[PDB]
Design an enzyme around this catalytic site. Structure first.
Site, PDB file in Angstrom:
ATOM      1  CB  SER A   1      51.789   3.028   2.756  1.00 55.00           C
ATOM      2  OG  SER A   1      50.451   3.287   2.371  1.00 55.00           O
TER       3      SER A   1
ATOM      4  CG  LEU B   1      59.094  10.784  -5.832  1.00 53.75           C
ATOM      5  CD1 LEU B   1      59.284  12.275  -5.925  1.00 53.75           C
ATOM      6  CD2 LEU B   1      60.437  10.035  -5.699  1.00 53.75           C
TER       7      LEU B   1
ATOM      8  CG  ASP C   1      50.948   2.622  -6.262  1.00 53.90           C
ATOM      9  OD1 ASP C   1      51.028   2.193  -5.082  1.00 53.90           O
ATOM     10  OD2 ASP C   1      51.267   3.792  -6.579  1.00 53.90           O
TER      11      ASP C   1
ATOM     12  CG  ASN D   1      47.921   1.686   1.726  1.00 56.16           C
ATOM     13  OD1 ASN D   1      47.506   2.603   1.003  1.00 56.16           O
ATOM     14  ND2 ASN D   1      48.845   0.796   1.326  1.00 56.16           N
TER      15      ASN D   1
END
Lengths: 227, 227
Positions: free
Chosen positions: B57, B189, B11, B60
């Site tokens: 992900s 998470l 991140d 994304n």
């Protein structure tokens, strides 16, 4: 802004009691139990709709029966206080009561069933709980309903979805945990509310659970707010 | 003492790029990619057996198409570099390559299939990945197999097990993560390796991913060990 659903894991009951030099470590559970009650009160007054307390894991059932019995009785007092008619809290058991024993399960079920369904504060008591197994039971529940409705074996292979599993978890029809309070400096997972807490905010404190204070709870809420 | 499997969540790229003053957030991704290459060397040299890196992900995938186009290009170069035969690293992909476009899907898959099956060091790259979505697909792979073994409708309803799901995930036959590293101080998470990391240690830092240094990696192994 405020957590819609707070989940609390109570680590450090035994560790806390050993620090203070209590030879008899079940004592830690008594203080942790007193603390759960105060926590629920704080949540309740803060304006939080749902709190989920971690009372008993399949992990805890690996302990020595001399102490497990003490722990089971303590859990049962806690639940009977949560369910007290003067609270008017709506209470649900999250987990299998098939692992805790006959007479306590009876006492627990009796207590929880006496609570209203409509209320302004809701509590989930996690007893006999494992996260991967919750998921497995949600899938079998889902697939029995589909079979009941007349799905063929070919149509079942494709019946499983992300919504279907949510609907069939113990926490069915509830919000997912917005905040997950973990204590005693533990940064490990436990698979507690494994599926539902996939996107929850984690909050950690070094303080052992029996030493958790209102000032720590306000720190938790501020930290959640500031993220 | 030392993790078998370290999983990493990268991140902060865009935030890092905007913090450095760039009008183009792709500088952050290109810098993240450099950091992945370095991270993997560190893991290998430290003695870690499996590394899992979270590249792309399903969240994304909802980006601006021209920015996603450029991100996926960076991810592809990252994996092509990871699969360089000088390394002798074993590479699997974890996620749906059917979500990223055909040319990237082809390039990625051909880089990975070129890597050895038996190696001292294994790398998972997570591309087109989501945690709950991975569980649903493991369930449907499970039921699909047993239908092919000629199972009945009611036999399928009972066939799902914890061990049965553990076999049908993208991480089939691999050790569960011991340590999960997340960056930009995000104590969320995001469901990364949801099932497999039910009992993993989490380690956090405030540093955006493209700022990750060998010293933080050292601090993470030091914390893991002392726990």
């Amino acid at each position: 802004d405020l957590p819609r659903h707070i989940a609390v894991l109570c680590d450090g009951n035994r560790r806390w009691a050993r620090s203070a030099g209590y030879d008899d470590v079940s004592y830690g559970y008594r203080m942790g139990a007193a603390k759960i009650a105060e926590m629920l009160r704080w949540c309740h007054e803060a304006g939080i709709e749902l709190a989920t307390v971690y009372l008993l894991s399949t992990e805890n059932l690996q302990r020595d029966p001399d102490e497990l019995a003490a722990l089971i009785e303590i859990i049962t007092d806690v639940v009977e206080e949560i369910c007290a008619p003067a609270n008017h809290w709506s209470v649900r058991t999250v987990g299998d009561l098939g692992l805790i024993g006959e007479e306590p399960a009876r006492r627990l079920r009796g207590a929880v069933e006496s609570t209203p369904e409509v209320a302004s504060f809701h509590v989930n008591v996690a007893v006999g709980y494992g996260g991967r197994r919750e998921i497995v039971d949600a899938v079998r529940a889902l697939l029995s309903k589909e079979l009941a409705n007349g799905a063929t074996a070919e149509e079942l292979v494709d019946a499983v979805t992300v919504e279907g599993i949510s609907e069939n978890l113990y926490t069915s029809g509830q919000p997912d945990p917005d905040l997950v309070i973990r204590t005693s400096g533990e940064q490990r997972l436990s698979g507690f509310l494994l599926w539902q807490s996939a996107y929850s905010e984690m909050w950690f404190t070094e303080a052992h659970w029996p030493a958790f204070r209102h000032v720590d709870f306000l720190r938790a809420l501020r930290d959640y707010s500031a993220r």
